[PDB]
Amino acid sequence: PEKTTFGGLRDQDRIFTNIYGRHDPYIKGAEARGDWYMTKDLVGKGRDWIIDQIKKSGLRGRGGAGFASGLKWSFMPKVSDGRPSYLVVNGDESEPGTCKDREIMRHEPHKLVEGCLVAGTAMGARAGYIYIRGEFVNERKAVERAVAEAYAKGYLGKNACGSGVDFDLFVHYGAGAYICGEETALIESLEGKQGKPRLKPPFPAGMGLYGCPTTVTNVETVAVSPTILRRGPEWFSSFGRKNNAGTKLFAISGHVNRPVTVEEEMSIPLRELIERHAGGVRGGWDNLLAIIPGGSSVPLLPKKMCDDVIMDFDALRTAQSGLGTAAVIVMNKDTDVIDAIARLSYFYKHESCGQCTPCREGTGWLYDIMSRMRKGDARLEEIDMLWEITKQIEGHTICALGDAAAWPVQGLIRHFRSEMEDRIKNADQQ
Amino acid sequence: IKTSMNRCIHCTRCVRFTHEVAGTSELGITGRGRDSEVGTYIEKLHSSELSGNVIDLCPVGALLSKPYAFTARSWELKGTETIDVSDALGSNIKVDCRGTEVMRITPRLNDAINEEWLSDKGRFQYDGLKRQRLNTPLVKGAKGLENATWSAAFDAIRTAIAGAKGNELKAIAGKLADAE
Ligand SMILES: Cc1cc2nc3c(=O)[nH]c(=O)nc-3n(C[C@H](O)[C@H](O)[C@H](O)COP(=O)(O)O)c2cc1C
Ligand code: SF4
Ligand code: SF4
């Protein structure tokens, strides 16, 4: 937590404690680990107190947005106009580099349920829905068992936890779509239609599920909120830098000696994280072509930038990338960056719902151009054309999947244009 | 309705019409991404009597009029603004003609009566304006109805009316008779 240096989080400061499933993930272990401790008091203190404590903690939103959780929760209506309020937890964790949410769902189900209770009381939501990926059948079974147990002991329902508050929780599951993770597209999917995002000028706080005020929040934010109210906002604020306070779950994947999911305070150096928790890059730090810091949506960073880069939101924004999800992917010198970015382009071409013209057409265009560049078929001007097309897509789409499709290609153009030019010229030469 | 779905830009005008206005709820966007397609998932035929309006609503010719297929181009047609006698709504229409032939009938905007919609019968009944037409006066003889001039037909009607008197003369007006 020291302002000069950040890293080396201790076990006493870790929110997610059975993340590795060495203990019983169900209610007996949850109670023995400190779950559902004094939820009666925290809920009874009123929605306003919870909102102010979350605001003071500085908890920004996990899941990619980074928007302050307290302000988003405070956008919820205070008094009913005849429309109930709903809490939907976005447990859809589709992202090519992110695996972190699955461990929370399968090994800490009760922290998530208790957090849903706390947040629904903070926002005055009568009912709650936990959206889960359809592929996560076993994780859904774990969450459903947690919900049933909480209902059995009276933690949920009317007079939940003994306080004069009423909250009902349901578990809903999709059928597989990356787009269904977006806030409006998730609402459309849960209503029963195609998971196509809704234009934002109507906002979900104003009009959401069944036309009623709703808030969509990630499992990780919902899970961390109750312990934030228990441990204290100052404790949560201490770890990170200014405006970037909390600890976050880092999922290291790719060419590392040990791929691990770990919890660490934000503003750790990326080199320190990779070397301590991941065991170092396969073949040493010297053997780095590039690292994708925040899952596939954000632009990649070359080794040189990865040397001094710090694992934070605003700093990665300064480094022309972003910490969407703490899903860091490491590539060796052996790796072909072109093929991986082409696979990401195919991913986005496959995951576009097709609603708006720019995404529906430009993502397939991007995939085709990247496929030709993967073999060297293209010309040297094709790179400039590719940059122009990425600029055409960005900002002109309904949701951010167009931006998430454009960004990796832009990062490839920006940092590894030399390798693309080499591949294009050599194929013509040979 | 003729379909060339390859020309389809994925607006949702046809789907929105079929749901909100026509109310048969037959068309939808089946698919995801670029290979998303418009149409009935099963082999179904559009049942509404307002089915013709999707052709006008379609901006890019993916939905087109099968009766009016490959017969003329837009610049070739002279449009005259008239009304539809198909029913008592009196839908305001624009009849497009090349030479002496009516080529197609399309609606006009009149919020008072027909917002901009036309029924299929009114839209596609111009086909029956070329068939079984009466061109000349006919007077009956032992050989049947035969060609006659206007004077001869009027003479026969005069000889017939001379016999009849008072209420023996009877008039029956049709569905398409005009006020004059
Ligand atoms: C194409 C697309 C896919 C997304 N997928 C997810 C996802 O799988 N999980 C998630 O938490 N957010 C996802 N998001 C971000 C959503 O906006 C998310 O519901 C919202 O940011 C959650 O807010 P929070 O930070 O308070 O949790 C996605 C956004 C887009 C545009
Ligand atoms: S950007 Fe892509 S995924 Fe988002 S609404 Fe448009 S077509 Fe659908
Ligand atoms: S109105 Fe025409 S262009 Fe639009 S979806 Fe229907 S067929 Fe396609």
Side-chain angles (χ1 to χ4, degrees), chain A residues 306-338:
Chain A
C306 283
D307 291 331
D308 190 359
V309 66
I310 194 66
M311 209 69 174
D312 189 358
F313 285 66
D314 62 358
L316 293 174
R317 207 177 38 170
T318 65
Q320 294 178 356
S321 291
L323 183 63
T325 71
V328 64
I329 297 169
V330 188
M331 293 180 183
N332 294 339
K333 298 292 184 182
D334 305 61
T335 298
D336 184 19
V337 298
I338 301 299

PDB file of all heavy atoms in Angstrom, chain A residues 306-338:
ATOM      1  N   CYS A 306       6.136  -2.853 -21.881  1.00  0.00           N
ATOM      2  CA  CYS A 306       5.901  -3.766 -20.767  1.00  0.00           C
ATOM      3  C   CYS A 306       6.982  -3.688 -19.699  1.00  0.00           C
ATOM      4  O   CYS A 306       6.761  -4.148 -18.574  1.00  0.00           O
ATOM      5  CB  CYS A 306       5.789  -5.197 -21.287  1.00  0.00           C
ATOM      6  SG  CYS A 306       4.202  -5.561 -22.047  1.00  0.00           S
ATOM      7  N   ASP A 307       8.146  -3.129 -20.029  1.00  0.00           N
ATOM      8  CA  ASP A 307       9.220  -3.003 -19.049  1.00  0.00           C
ATOM      9  C   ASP A 307       8.828  -2.108 -17.876  1.00  0.00           C
ATOM     10  O   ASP A 307       8.959  -2.502 -16.712  1.00  0.00           O
ATOM     11  CB  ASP A 307      10.480  -2.474 -19.731  1.00  0.00           C
ATOM     12  CG  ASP A 307      11.088  -3.480 -20.685  1.00  0.00           C
ATOM     13  OD1 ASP A 307      10.927  -4.695 -20.448  1.00  0.00           O
ATOM     14  OD2 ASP A 307      11.724  -3.055 -21.672  1.00  0.00           O
ATOM     15  N   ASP A 308       8.348  -0.899 -18.158  1.00  0.00           N
ATOM     16  CA  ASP A 308       8.064   0.076 -17.113  1.00  0.00           C
ATOM     17  C   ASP A 308       6.563   0.224 -16.841  1.00  0.00           C
ATOM     18  O   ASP A 308       6.172   0.985 -15.954  1.00  0.00           O
ATOM     19  CB  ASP A 308       8.689   1.424 -17.528  1.00  0.00           C
ATOM     20  CG  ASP A 308       8.678   2.484 -16.426  1.00  0.00           C
ATOM     21  OD1 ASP A 308       8.177   2.246 -15.309  1.00  0.00           O
ATOM     22  OD2 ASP A 308       9.193   3.590 -16.693  1.00  0.00           O
ATOM     23  N   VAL A 309       5.710  -0.510 -17.557  1.00  0.00           N
ATOM     24  CA  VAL A 309       4.270  -0.305 -17.437  1.00  0.00           C
ATOM     25  C   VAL A 309       3.790  -0.777 -16.071  1.00  0.00           C
ATOM     26  O   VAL A 309       4.315  -1.746 -15.505  1.00  0.00           O
ATOM     27  CB  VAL A 309       3.513  -1.029 -18.563  1.00  0.00           C
ATOM     28  CG1 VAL A 309       3.662  -2.533 -18.432  1.00  0.00           C
ATOM     29  CG2 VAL A 309       2.058  -0.614 -18.585  1.00  0.00           C
ATOM     30  N   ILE A 310       2.803  -0.076 -15.518  1.00  0.00           N
ATOM     31  CA  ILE A 310       2.271  -0.381 -14.197  1.00  0.00           C
ATOM     32  C   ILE A 310       0.829  -0.835 -14.391  1.00  0.00           C
ATOM     33  O   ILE A 310       0.119  -0.322 -15.264  1.00  0.00           O
ATOM     34  CB  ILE A 310       2.370   0.845 -13.263  1.00  0.00           C
ATOM     35  CG1 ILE A 310       2.136   0.465 -11.808  1.00  0.00           C
ATOM     36  CG2 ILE A 310       1.399   1.917 -13.652  1.00  0.00           C
ATOM     37  CD1 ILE A 310       3.212  -0.410 -11.272  1.00  0.00           C
ATOM     38  N   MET A 311       0.411  -1.829 -13.609  1.00  0.00           N
ATOM     39  CA  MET A 311      -0.890  -2.481 -13.793  1.00  0.00           C
ATOM     40  C   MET A 311      -1.999  -1.644 -13.158  1.00  0.00           C
ATOM     41  O   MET A 311      -2.445  -1.890 -12.035  1.00  0.00           O
ATOM     42  CB  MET A 311      -0.867  -3.895 -13.235  1.00  0.00           C
ATOM     43  CG  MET A 311      -1.810  -4.834 -13.954  1.00  0.00           C
ATOM     44  SD  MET A 311      -1.275  -5.199 -15.635  1.00  0.00           S
ATOM     45  CE  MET A 311      -2.472  -6.446 -16.102  1.00  0.00           C
ATOM     46  N   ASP A 312      -2.460  -0.640 -13.896  1.00  0.00           N
ATOM     47  CA  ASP A 312      -3.504   0.236 -13.386  1.00  0.00           C
ATOM     48  C   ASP A 312      -4.404   0.662 -14.541  1.00  0.00           C
ATOM     49  O   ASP A 312      -4.074   0.473 -15.712  1.00  0.00           O
ATOM     50  CB  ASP A 312      -2.894   1.442 -12.663  1.00  0.00           C
ATOM     51  CG  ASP A 312      -3.927   2.261 -11.933  1.00  0.00           C
ATOM     52  OD1 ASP A 312      -5.117   1.904 -12.020  1.00  0.00           O
ATOM     53  OD2 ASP A 312      -3.553   3.252 -11.275  1.00  0.00           O
ATOM     54  N   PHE A 313      -5.552   1.252 -14.196  1.00  0.00           N
ATOM     55  CA  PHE A 313      -6.487   1.730 -15.210  1.00  0.00           C
ATOM     56  C   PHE A 313      -5.918   2.926 -15.965  1.00  0.00           C
ATOM     57  O   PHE A 313      -5.675   2.860 -17.179  1.00  0.00           O
ATOM     58  CB  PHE A 313      -7.813   2.127 -14.555  1.00  0.00           C
ATOM     59  CG  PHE A 313      -8.677   0.972 -14.141  1.00  0.00           C
ATOM     60  CD1 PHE A 313      -8.278   0.109 -13.137  1.00  0.00           C
ATOM     61  CD2 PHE A 313      -9.904   0.766 -14.744  1.00  0.00           C
ATOM     62  CE1 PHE A 313      -9.082  -0.945 -12.755  1.00  0.00           C
ATOM     63  CE2 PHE A 313     -10.711  -0.288 -14.366  1.00  0.00           C
ATOM     64  CZ  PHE A 313     -10.300  -1.143 -13.370  1.00  0.00           C
ATOM     65  N   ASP A 314      -5.707   4.034 -15.254  1.00  0.00           N
ATOM     66  CA  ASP A 314      -5.334   5.286 -15.902  1.00  0.00           C
ATOM     67  C   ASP A 314      -3.982   5.177 -16.593  1.00  0.00           C
ATOM     68  O   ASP A 314      -3.776   5.756 -17.664  1.00  0.00           O
ATOM     69  CB  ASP A 314      -5.347   6.423 -14.880  1.00  0.00           C
ATOM     70  CG  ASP A 314      -4.342   6.223 -13.758  1.00  0.00           C
ATOM     71  OD1 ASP A 314      -3.656   5.178 -13.735  1.00  0.00           O
ATOM     72  OD2 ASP A 314      -4.242   7.117 -12.892  1.00  0.00           O
ATOM     73  N   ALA A 315      -3.043   4.450 -15.989  1.00  0.00           N
ATOM     74  CA  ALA A 315      -1.718   4.315 -16.581  1.00  0.00           C
ATOM     75  C   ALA A 315      -1.765   3.534 -17.887  1.00  0.00           C
ATOM     76  O   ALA A 315      -1.143   3.933 -18.879  1.00  0.00           O
ATOM     77  CB  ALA A 315      -0.775   3.646 -15.590  1.00  0.00           C
ATOM     78  N   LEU A 316      -2.484   2.410 -17.909  1.00  0.00           N
ATOM     79  CA  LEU A 316      -2.688   1.707 -19.171  1.00  0.00           C
ATOM     80  C   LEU A 316      -3.436   2.562 -20.182  1.00  0.00           C
ATOM     81  O   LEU A 316      -3.226   2.410 -21.390  1.00  0.00           O
ATOM     82  CB  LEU A 316      -3.412   0.381 -18.943  1.00  0.00           C
ATOM     83  CG  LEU A 316      -2.608  -0.665 -18.171  1.00  0.00           C
ATOM     84  CD1 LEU A 316      -3.446  -1.881 -17.864  1.00  0.00           C
ATOM     85  CD2 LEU A 316      -1.411  -1.069 -18.992  1.00  0.00           C
ATOM     86  N   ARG A 317      -4.302   3.468 -19.724  1.00  0.00           N
ATOM     87  CA  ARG A 317      -4.877   4.430 -20.659  1.00  0.00           C
ATOM     88  C   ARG A 317      -3.797   5.332 -21.246  1.00  0.00           C
ATOM     89  O   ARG A 317      -3.811   5.635 -22.444  1.00  0.00           O
ATOM     90  CB  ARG A 317      -5.952   5.271 -19.975  1.00  0.00           C
ATOM     91  CG  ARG A 317      -7.007   5.794 -20.932  1.00  0.00           C
ATOM     92  CD  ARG A 317      -8.087   6.569 -20.204  1.00  0.00           C
ATOM     93  NE  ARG A 317      -7.537   7.363 -19.112  1.00  0.00           N
ATOM     94  CZ  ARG A 317      -8.220   8.271 -18.430  1.00  0.00           C
ATOM     95  NH1 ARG A 317      -9.485   8.539 -18.709  1.00  0.00           N
ATOM     96  NH2 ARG A 317      -7.618   8.931 -17.445  1.00  0.00           N
ATOM     97  N   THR A 318      -2.851   5.772 -20.412  1.00  0.00           N
ATOM     98  CA  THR A 318      -1.734   6.578 -20.899  1.00  0.00           C
ATOM     99  C   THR A 318      -0.844   5.790 -21.848  1.00  0.00           C
ATOM    100  O   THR A 318      -0.249   6.367 -22.764  1.00  0.00           O
ATOM    101  CB  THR A 318      -0.906   7.114 -19.731  1.00  0.00           C
ATOM    102  OG1 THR A 318      -0.291   6.023 -19.033  1.00  0.00           O
ATOM    103  CG2 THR A 318      -1.777   7.915 -18.777  1.00  0.00           C
ATOM    104  N   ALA A 319      -0.738   4.478 -21.646  1.00  0.00           N
ATOM    105  CA  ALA A 319       0.050   3.614 -22.511  1.00  0.00           C
ATOM    106  C   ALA A 319      -0.744   3.102 -23.703  1.00  0.00           C
ATOM    107  O   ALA A 319      -0.361   2.092 -24.302  1.00  0.00           O
ATOM    108  CB  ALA A 319       0.615   2.439 -21.711  1.00  0.00           C
ATOM    109  N   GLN A 320      -1.843   3.775 -24.050  1.00  0.00           N
ATOM    110  CA  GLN A 320      -2.620   3.464 -25.249  1.00  0.00           C
ATOM    111  C   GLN A 320      -3.150   2.032 -25.217  1.00  0.00           C
ATOM    112  O   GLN A 320      -3.138   1.316 -26.219  1.00  0.00           O
ATOM    113  CB  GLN A 320      -1.790   3.738 -26.503  1.00  0.00           C
ATOM    114  CG  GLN A 320      -1.491   5.223 -26.673  1.00  0.00           C
ATOM    115  CD  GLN A 320      -0.640   5.528 -27.884  1.00  0.00           C
ATOM    116  OE1 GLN A 320      -0.199   4.625 -28.586  1.00  0.00           O
ATOM    117  NE2 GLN A 320      -0.405   6.810 -28.138  1.00  0.00           N
ATOM    118  N   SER A 321      -3.611   1.618 -24.042  1.00  0.00           N
ATOM    119  CA  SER A 321      -4.223   0.317 -23.805  1.00  0.00           C
ATOM    120  C   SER A 321      -5.246   0.502 -22.689  1.00  0.00           C
ATOM    121  O   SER A 321      -5.670   1.627 -22.405  1.00  0.00           O
ATOM    122  CB  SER A 321      -3.155  -0.740 -23.485  1.00  0.00           C
ATOM    123  OG  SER A 321      -2.370  -1.017 -24.628  1.00  0.00           O
ATOM    124  N   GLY A 322      -5.669  -0.594 -22.069  1.00  0.00           N
ATOM    125  CA  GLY A 322      -6.613  -0.496 -20.974  1.00  0.00           C
ATOM    126  C   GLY A 322      -6.651  -1.758 -20.149  1.00  0.00           C
ATOM    127  O   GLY A 322      -6.338  -2.849 -20.635  1.00  0.00           O
ATOM    128  N   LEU A 323      -6.998  -1.597 -18.875  1.00  0.00           N
ATOM    129  CA  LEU A 323      -7.211  -2.726 -17.974  1.00  0.00           C
ATOM    130  C   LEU A 323      -8.704  -3.042 -17.923  1.00  0.00           C
ATOM    131  O   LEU A 323      -9.394  -2.802 -16.930  1.00  0.00           O
ATOM    132  CB  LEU A 323      -6.654  -2.413 -16.588  1.00  0.00           C
ATOM    133  CG  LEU A 323      -6.727  -3.515 -15.528  1.00  0.00           C
ATOM    134  CD1 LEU A 323      -5.906  -4.720 -15.954  1.00  0.00           C
ATOM    135  CD2 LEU A 323      -6.270  -3.000 -14.177  1.00  0.00           C
ATOM    136  N   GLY A 324      -9.213  -3.558 -19.039  1.00  0.00           N
ATOM    137  CA  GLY A 324     -10.603  -3.968 -19.063  1.00  0.00           C
ATOM    138  C   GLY A 324     -10.880  -5.052 -18.046  1.00  0.00           C
ATOM    139  O   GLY A 324     -11.626  -4.844 -17.085  1.00  0.00           O
ATOM    140  N   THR A 325     -10.268  -6.211 -18.239  1.00  0.00           N
ATOM    141  CA  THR A 325     -10.242  -7.270 -17.245  1.00  0.00           C
ATOM    142  C   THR A 325      -8.791  -7.634 -16.974  1.00  0.00           C
ATOM    143  O   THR A 325      -7.946  -7.567 -17.868  1.00  0.00           O
ATOM    144  CB  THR A 325     -11.013  -8.508 -17.710  1.00  0.00           C
ATOM    145  OG1 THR A 325     -10.287  -9.159 -18.759  1.00  0.00           O
ATOM    146  CG2 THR A 325     -12.388  -8.122 -18.223  1.00  0.00           C
ATOM    147  N   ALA A 326      -8.497  -8.024 -15.739  1.00  0.00           N
ATOM    148  CA  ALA A 326      -7.123  -8.374 -15.408  1.00  0.00           C
ATOM    149  C   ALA A 326      -6.795  -9.732 -16.011  1.00  0.00           C
ATOM    150  O   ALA A 326      -6.611 -10.719 -15.292  1.00  0.00           O
ATOM    151  CB  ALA A 326      -6.906  -8.375 -13.900  1.00  0.00           C
ATOM    152  N   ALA A 327      -6.732  -9.782 -17.338  1.00  0.00           N
ATOM    153  CA  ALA A 327      -6.489 -10.996 -18.108  1.00  0.00           C
ATOM    154  C   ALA A 327      -5.252 -10.742 -18.960  1.00  0.00           C
ATOM    155  O   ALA A 327      -5.356 -10.336 -20.119  1.00  0.00           O
ATOM    156  CB  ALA A 327      -7.691 -11.350 -18.954  1.00  0.00           C
ATOM    157  N   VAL A 328      -4.085 -10.985 -18.380  1.00  0.00           N
ATOM    158  CA  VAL A 328      -2.813 -10.680 -19.020  1.00  0.00           C
ATOM    159  C   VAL A 328      -2.320 -11.905 -19.785  1.00  0.00           C
ATOM    160  O   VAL A 328      -2.245 -13.012 -19.240  1.00  0.00           O
ATOM    161  CB  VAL A 328      -1.786 -10.190 -17.982  1.00  0.00           C
ATOM    162  CG1 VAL A 328      -1.446 -11.267 -16.978  1.00  0.00           C
ATOM    163  CG2 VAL A 328      -0.535  -9.704 -18.665  1.00  0.00           C
ATOM    164  N   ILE A 329      -2.032 -11.712 -21.072  1.00  0.00           N
ATOM    165  CA  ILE A 329      -1.637 -12.782 -21.981  1.00  0.00           C
ATOM    166  C   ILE A 329      -0.221 -12.495 -22.466  1.00  0.00           C
ATOM    167  O   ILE A 329       0.050 -11.411 -22.993  1.00  0.00           O
ATOM    168  CB  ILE A 329      -2.610 -12.888 -23.168  1.00  0.00           C
ATOM    169  CG1 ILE A 329      -4.010 -13.247 -22.672  1.00  0.00           C
ATOM    170  CG2 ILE A 329      -2.123 -13.920 -24.166  1.00  0.00           C
ATOM    171  CD1 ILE A 329      -5.081 -13.114 -23.726  1.00  0.00           C
ATOM    172  N   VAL A 330       0.674 -13.467 -22.296  1.00  0.00           N
ATOM    173  CA  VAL A 330       2.098 -13.295 -22.565  1.00  0.00           C
ATOM    174  C   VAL A 330       2.479 -14.081 -23.813  1.00  0.00           C
ATOM    175  O   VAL A 330       2.091 -15.245 -23.962  1.00  0.00           O
ATOM    176  CB  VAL A 330       2.940 -13.739 -21.357  1.00  0.00           C
ATOM    177  CG1 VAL A 330       4.383 -13.373 -21.564  1.00  0.00           C
ATOM    178  CG2 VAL A 330       2.410 -13.091 -20.093  1.00  0.00           C
ATOM    179  N   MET A 331       3.227 -13.439 -24.711  1.00  0.00           N
ATOM    180  CA  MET A 331       3.692 -14.050 -25.949  1.00  0.00           C
ATOM    181  C   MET A 331       5.216 -14.095 -26.014  1.00  0.00           C
ATOM    182  O   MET A 331       5.887 -13.111 -25.691  1.00  0.00           O
ATOM    183  CB  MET A 331       3.160 -13.273 -27.153  1.00  0.00           C
ATOM    184  CG  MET A 331       1.661 -13.359 -27.335  1.00  0.00           C
ATOM    185  SD  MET A 331       1.101 -12.418 -28.761  1.00  0.00           S
ATOM    186  CE  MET A 331      -0.665 -12.645 -28.631  1.00  0.00           C
ATOM    187  N   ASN A 332       5.758 -15.239 -26.433  1.00  0.00           N
ATOM    188  CA  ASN A 332       7.195 -15.430 -26.587  1.00  0.00           C
ATOM    189  C   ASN A 332       7.678 -14.824 -27.903  1.00  0.00           C
ATOM    190  O   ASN A 332       6.891 -14.376 -28.738  1.00  0.00           O
ATOM    191  CB  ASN A 332       7.572 -16.908 -26.541  1.00  0.00           C
ATOM    192  CG  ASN A 332       7.309 -17.533 -25.201  1.00  0.00           C
ATOM    193  OD1 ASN A 332       7.217 -16.841 -24.187  1.00  0.00           O
ATOM    194  ND2 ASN A 332       7.172 -18.851 -25.183  1.00  0.00           N
ATOM    195  N   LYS A 333       9.004 -14.809 -28.083  1.00  0.00           N
ATOM    196  CA  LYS A 333       9.544 -14.498 -29.404  1.00  0.00           C
ATOM    197  C   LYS A 333       9.087 -15.511 -30.442  1.00  0.00           C
ATOM    198  O   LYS A 333       8.916 -15.163 -31.616  1.00  0.00           O
ATOM    199  CB  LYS A 333      11.073 -14.464 -29.366  1.00  0.00           C
ATOM    200  CG  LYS A 333      11.694 -13.414 -28.468  1.00  0.00           C
ATOM    201  CD  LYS A 333      11.439 -12.013 -28.990  1.00  0.00           C
ATOM    202  CE  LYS A 333      12.142 -10.979 -28.129  1.00  0.00           C
ATOM    203  NZ  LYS A 333      11.875  -9.590 -28.591  1.00  0.00           N
ATOM    204  N   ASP A 334       8.896 -16.770 -30.034  1.00  0.00           N
ATOM    205  CA  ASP A 334       8.465 -17.799 -30.976  1.00  0.00           C
ATOM    206  C   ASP A 334       7.069 -17.519 -31.513  1.00  0.00           C
ATOM    207  O   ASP A 334       6.750 -17.904 -32.644  1.00  0.00           O
ATOM    208  CB  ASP A 334       8.516 -19.173 -30.312  1.00  0.00           C
ATOM    209  CG  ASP A 334       9.884 -19.493 -29.743  1.00  0.00           C
ATOM    210  OD1 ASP A 334      10.348 -18.751 -28.853  1.00  0.00           O
ATOM    211  OD2 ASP A 334      10.495 -20.486 -30.190  1.00  0.00           O
ATOM    212  N   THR A 335       6.227 -16.865 -30.717  1.00  0.00           N
ATOM    213  CA  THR A 335       4.842 -16.632 -31.101  1.00  0.00           C
ATOM    214  C   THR A 335       4.771 -15.773 -32.357  1.00  0.00           C
ATOM    215  O   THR A 335       5.563 -14.845 -32.541  1.00  0.00           O
ATOM    216  CB  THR A 335       4.091 -15.955 -29.953  1.00  0.00           C
ATOM    217  OG1 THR A 335       4.079 -16.824 -28.815  1.00  0.00           O
ATOM    218  CG2 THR A 335       2.656 -15.637 -30.347  1.00  0.00           C
ATOM    219  N   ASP A 336       3.819 -16.093 -33.228  1.00  0.00           N
ATOM    220  CA  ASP A 336       3.503 -15.258 -34.380  1.00  0.00           C
ATOM    221  C   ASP A 336       2.359 -14.325 -33.998  1.00  0.00           C
ATOM    222  O   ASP A 336       1.211 -14.762 -33.877  1.00  0.00           O
ATOM    223  CB  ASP A 336       3.135 -16.121 -35.583  1.00  0.00           C
ATOM    224  CG  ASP A 336       2.887 -15.304 -36.833  1.00  0.00           C
ATOM    225  OD1 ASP A 336       3.343 -14.144 -36.887  1.00  0.00           O
ATOM    226  OD2 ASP A 336       2.237 -15.822 -37.765  1.00  0.00           O
ATOM    227  N   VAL A 337       2.673 -13.042 -33.799  1.00  0.00           N
ATOM    228  CA  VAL A 337       1.655 -12.089 -33.364  1.00  0.00           C
ATOM    229  C   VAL A 337       0.562 -11.964 -34.414  1.00  0.00           C
ATOM    230  O   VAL A 337      -0.612 -11.761 -34.080  1.00  0.00           O
ATOM    231  CB  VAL A 337       2.284 -10.724 -33.025  1.00  0.00           C
ATOM    232  CG1 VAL A 337       3.256 -10.869 -31.874  1.00  0.00           C
ATOM    233  CG2 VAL A 337       2.985 -10.132 -34.237  1.00  0.00           C
ATOM    234  N   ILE A 338       0.929 -12.067 -35.692  1.00  0.00           N
ATOM    235  CA  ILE A 338      -0.035 -11.881 -36.770  1.00  0.00           C
ATOM    236  C   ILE A 338      -1.137 -12.922 -36.672  1.00  0.00           C
ATOM    237  O   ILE A 338      -2.323 -12.610 -36.823  1.00  0.00           O
ATOM    238  CB  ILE A 338       0.673 -11.934 -38.133  1.00  0.00           C
ATOM    239  CG1 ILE A 338       1.742 -10.852 -38.194  1.00  0.00           C
ATOM    240  CG2 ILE A 338      -0.327 -11.725 -39.249  1.00  0.00           C
ATOM    241  CD1 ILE A 338       1.182  -9.486 -38.047  1.00  0.00           C
TER     242      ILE A 338
END
